[model samples]
Target: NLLTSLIRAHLDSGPNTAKLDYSKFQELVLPRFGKEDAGDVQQFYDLLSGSLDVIRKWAEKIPGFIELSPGDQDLLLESAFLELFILRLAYRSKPGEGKLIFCSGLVLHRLQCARGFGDWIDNILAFSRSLHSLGVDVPAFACLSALVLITDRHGLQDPRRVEELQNRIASCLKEHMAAVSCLSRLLGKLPELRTLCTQGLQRIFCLKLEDLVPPPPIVDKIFMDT
Candidate 1:
């Protein structure tokens, strides 16, 4: 029930600021349209930090997440951050149009994001296309996001509980789906997420060494653990 109710709410509420009108988003978050270019790594990191915070809030809202030990919570959240980010982006974006819709309802075209993202952006778009090719449902993705957060991460203080949480979500996922193999198809995306996560770590490392701007403090932690 928590899986259904809590994650259902996350998709409906936390992911996009309650589906606020796009015009209002441009009005509220961006007073002037297309003024800021996400060209440099610094500006891209700024946008990432915003989405990272939004993702954190959604992770906290996952059922049984706060019940974990602080160490486990930190490990699980950080370990899954990029995987969750890519998965969510793949779910929300329009790959055919090369539009990436981030967690904050921020829209950036694939080309607009490519310079900062390097080759990672294109792979992410390709992943999105494959995801959409499967015709993934929001019901499935809601539980999938929960499962990604509630992982048996390497250093979790009590991995048994994380395992239990993951199994619980799997049950709900089964109950919501139509075909048996769909679960396998959903699970198939995890490997791509692993590659995407590595690409992001490298991208962050490049920015840190370039010293264009200090990598955001949390990004350093994400880079270290993720």
Candidate 2:
């Protein structure tokens, strides 16, 4: 499966940025006062930018992703950014330990991130546990991640073209899984991803309204249009 191979090859290399442990995160982000330090929000957006960077690079490597119209490409990414964020975090995080390993491979406990991540972190952890219980492997998760981005998002320039790519990935995933139950459960996670994405948008919106810390310019644009 070239599709799976392409995904696996990119994911194997991991993100271009360096992974940060607790101490490293502390070093990178300076301390500030307040129960939920405004710095946490800053750090959180920093992470979002990094995660979005890695996602865009990975998206380009997919067979059909680069071929979409500029408008379609922009729309696809904007629509799916947070969904991709949550889905990958859920897949990679260590739920029992309460650690979220970011796309850039930064490690932080749920307690440390609560200020930044708010309530969505807990939901992401729960989804992590659910995924872990199923023992899903690399290949399946790769396809799932691709499907997250390649979805038939509304307002796409050529939805039929988008659907064609999606169908290819879906059939590729279908061929690899034998357990009907596991695949069913995997499919069920789409709505969950959508829900998490929605919560994420609200969190960002409220944060913007508070005006405690400004949203990143790229993120501002992403939110403004959506």
Candidate 3:
């Protein structure tokens, strides 16, 4: 399945460690979409762009994806990219230690971030905590990530098709969650996840206006062009 493979791609990206030297961690890590230097800002932009590309490439391999009209696919990708990124970030996070683990093996601490990021950072950690609290595992999260991608937002050219995809993913999630008997809990988490995505988008808008640096082209498209 595409969701499973997408999850695998992330897992296969390697160095699955969340530990960092205390000094280095402090000097390097910051909350996502925070006020940081051009270097850090550029790194964040690259991270988002890279993840978006990774997911898009793998999602294309999903069975029904090729059936989606180009317009519908574009709409879906634009709408869900950030949400899926956040979902995968949460999945890879070290929630117990309040750290978001990125693909570069940079583990960012919640307490180490700036005041401006306090609310956003807290929201992300809270969402991570909720997932951890529920004991939602990788397979379940894989399905959940797929559900995020197939969301039926306002402008999808084929909302029904999106819904159909969403329903299929939902069924897969239910099947997986059933093992842990967290079907209801996982379903309930969807709105909370969407809320986190909304908060993330808001932060992106805030950061873009700050103009710390011009974002990478892919990042600009995902955050601005859309």
Candidate 4:
């Protein structure tokens, strides 16, 4: 039980902190990608499950644990889910069409859990619907922006005025502040462009009609090469 708490502490305290480093994570801190070759991934998942079970038993013994502060609950839930996310990322990285579909499906399931966020729920649904209509070759940075709109403002608890803060995240992502911050959070895994621009993630509805920038017209002089 004590060991379980320790692992939970690591997950909760590390990523969610105010000071975060993106490049350092990619270079030094991330787990090795080829866990299956060494039979490490399965062992990690099994250990995680066992740790959670012990914690469940320990929590059951504590009276009025349910009445604990939201801060405590947030730490536990976020830490647990982060482990689940890493494990999913590890096992699903095979380079195949089937695995691509599997990964998109898994992300969709994760997004659905965002429904608990009140009206921010509506914003995400709208963004997802737009992505579906987009259909192909959507830009990688654009995709990142769309996800930021979903996570930071999804009204995870309160329902009132949920939408008032909706487009704010979209704006932040485009303004480049929130987008960079969000990217930094995922420093552990810098996914390649090909993997990110999936057909399932095409249109990002968060983009406004005014924000659209047109491509420059081609000139024959510049187009010709010696």
Candidate 5:
């Protein structure tokens, strides 16, 4: 997906080699109507252009950290960051509030970590793995961030905290392990983290992370396909 965005970005900017005119680029192809507005478009642009620079910088500074480090790892990271940041930013409906705050970075980070895991479904599975690996397999800073986006967008998470929220969530999961497992089975098979994360919030909170997310694709297949 990021690769596709870069290609579109290049196309939008023309073949000038140095200029990447994202304004002309229509990678996300935002909606002209509906709830979407100018702020959404502007934010998307900022994420793309701004992140491009950040990825470039990352490559130049920490090539080793990148899975496929080119000359400008920073540039790549920045580009990737654009996509990740947008996902994180989407987690927030209100200016300073979120239902699941931790996933803000976790979703993106999981996507980053899962890049080499074959196709989109495999990547999402890898992301699920990372989510499950966390202590208690519950949401954290970045993880919560992504979940808030998922829950709010889909009416998944409980809006009103009727009790000790975490405890309530924990109790619910314990009582309905099978229900959670079913969702996990589906989530673990999704092809894209962006899509899967958006869909998996309800299931995860209702069940266990393993019950919702799939495992990453085999390393050999991932490397081979990449």
Candidate 6:
């Protein structure tokens, strides 16, 4: 109940980016990219950094999250950040119209992600459509976000403890999905989420290799270790 309440609070605490007016989307772009003719890679990282902050802050409030060792916490965040990012990204996307809307109100056309996103943009768009097809609701997505963070990741200082946390979240997710008899189908999505995250990592690495723009400090650290 606490988890659901927290999630509901989070869901209510923000404006729905999917409904933002197209005119406001440009304001989400950084000033440095004001004159760039094409999609600026730097703007992507800047947007990602902001998303990371929002997700991190929400995760920090999860009960028992603060109990993990600092190292374990960092490890969990590193391992799950991209997965959760993709999940939320897909959740907020207007797949039917081929639009990916960020929390900052930035809307990128499905066709335009190629400049910085590369081929991974296609994968993300595909994944977003699949997720949209499911008609996943807010509570289900909130539970999925928790499951992402509580994954059995390598290098955690307390893997067993993390798994325990994951089980609890999984139970919560099951209860929610059972209402629609799609519990197993939704559960089946974890592997796909992982695959998407993997592709995203490759994209990030490629961007880093290009050296066209530096990632934010947090992303730089994660990419270095990745």
Top-scoring candidate (TM-score): 2
What is the model-wide C-alpha lDDT for candidate 2?
0.77
lDDT of 6 by residue, 1-226 (tens): 6556557645753346566647523322322323222246776787678777777776777767778889888778866777777887877777677677776556867655556666677787788888877777777877777777878776778888888877877877787677645876777777777788788788778777777766777667667666
Runs of candidate 6 exceeding 4 Å displacement: 9-39
Model 4: how far residue 140 lies from native, Å: 8.7
Candidate 1 lDDT over residue span 131-226, tens digit each: 888887777888888888887777677788999988888888887775438788888987887888888888878777777667776688787774
All candidates: CA RMSD (Å): 4.8, 3.6, 4.2, 20.9, 19.5, 4.4
Q: Which stretches of candidate 3 lie over 4 Å from their true place?
A: 1-35, 111-118, 179-181, 218-226
Sort by TM-score, best first. 2, 1, 6, 3, 5, 4
* lDDT, candidate 5, 1-226, per-residue tens: 2222322332332223233233323222232333323343333233334434433432232212233324232222322342343333332211221111122111122222221211332433444444444322222222222222212111222323212233333333344434335435433432344565433332222222222233222212212222
- In model 6, pairs of residues that clash are none
- Superposed model 1: Cα runs more than 4 Å off: 12-39, 178-180
Query: All candidates' lDDT scores?
Result: 0.74, 0.77, 0.68, 0.29, 0.30, 0.71
Q: Per-residue error at 222 for model 3, in Å?
A: 4.6
Q: Once all C-alphas are superposed, what RMSD does model 4 give against the true structure? A: 20.9
In angstroms, give how far residue 103 of model 2 lies from its true place.
Answer: 1.1
Error of 6 at 34 (Å): 19
TM-score of 1: 0.85
* Model 4 misplaced stretches (Cα beyond 4 Å): 1-43, 46-156, 161-166, 177-226
* Per-residue alpha-carbon lDDT of candidate 3 for residues 1-226, written as tens digits (9 for 90 to 100): 6556645744554334654324336533543554477665565667677776666775675557769999988767777787777776776778677777654556767655444343777777778777878887777776766677778777677788889878877776676566553677777887888788777767677777877878666556666644
Cα TM-score per model? 0.85, 0.87, 0.76, 0.21, 0.25, 0.83
Ranking by lDDT: 2, 1, 6, 3, 5, 4
Is 5 or 6 the stronger prediction by TM-score?
Answer: 6
Q: Which of the numbered candidates is closest to the native, going by highest lDDT?
A: 2
